[PDB]
Design a binder for this molecule. Structure first.
Ligand SMILES: COC[C@H](c1cnn2cc([C@@H](NC(=O)/C(F)=C\C3CC3)C3CCC(F)(F)CC3)nc2c1)N1C[C@@H](C(F)(F)F)NC1=O
Lengths: 98, 98
């Protein structure tokens, strides 16, 4: 066990023009800290071209990143957690299919 | 102070095809947990077009996300931290300039 103390009191539209734009989706888990995680969902299957139209010869893909979260241990505990890895979507990029 | 206990013991080649590709940069901070954060740096100023060439009519931009990290409190403490917000580049997207 590597138990440390953590003080949870935190110290102190641009991407709308993307060819692979995204919206935010609320992921809520009461057994986790942070309980609310905003994930990116690509608006389209294709990428928006210069004309403002969707081109399906390319794909908008979510960028999946491993992040660390705190899991309540034992369950429902207000003050004790275990570090845990989860995969979250942090944005979208445009890719040329294989 | 909202002090909790945390047990720190936990129980990419597709994005190479991006029109706004990026490389990973190691961001190391001994006063922070995680000490190592992999940050995205856009490979080009422009985006890769259908011909496979870097096209400057569009821009590769880094996607910045606010990320929570643990800051050693007091400084150099091996087992006590305070939650803190930083901005991290997690990937690149292609945008149409304004
Ligand atoms: C300011 O709140 C932004 C929020 C968010 C959500 N969850 N979250 C997890 C982490 C961890 N840090 C990391 O995972 C980390 F530092 C680095 C890895 C490499 C990027 C922490 C957790 C607490 C800790 F006490 F466990 C120390 C670790 N921070 C965050 C930040 N966001 C951001 C955006 C998202 F998709 F990117 F998540 N959507 C969100 O909802």
């Amino acid at each position: 066990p590597r138990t440390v103390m953590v003080n949870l009191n935190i110290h102190n539209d641009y991407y709308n023009r993307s060819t692979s734009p995204w919206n935010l989706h609320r992921n809520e888990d009461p057994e986790r800290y942070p309980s609310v995680i905003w994930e990116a969902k690509c608006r389209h299957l294709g990428c928006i071209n210069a004309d403002g139209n969707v081109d399906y010869h390319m794909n908008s893909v979510p960028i999946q990143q491993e992040i660390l979260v705190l899991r309540r241990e034992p369950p429902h505990s207000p003050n004790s957690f275990r570090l845990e890895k989860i995969l979250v979507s942090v944005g979208c990029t445009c890719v040329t299919p294989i």
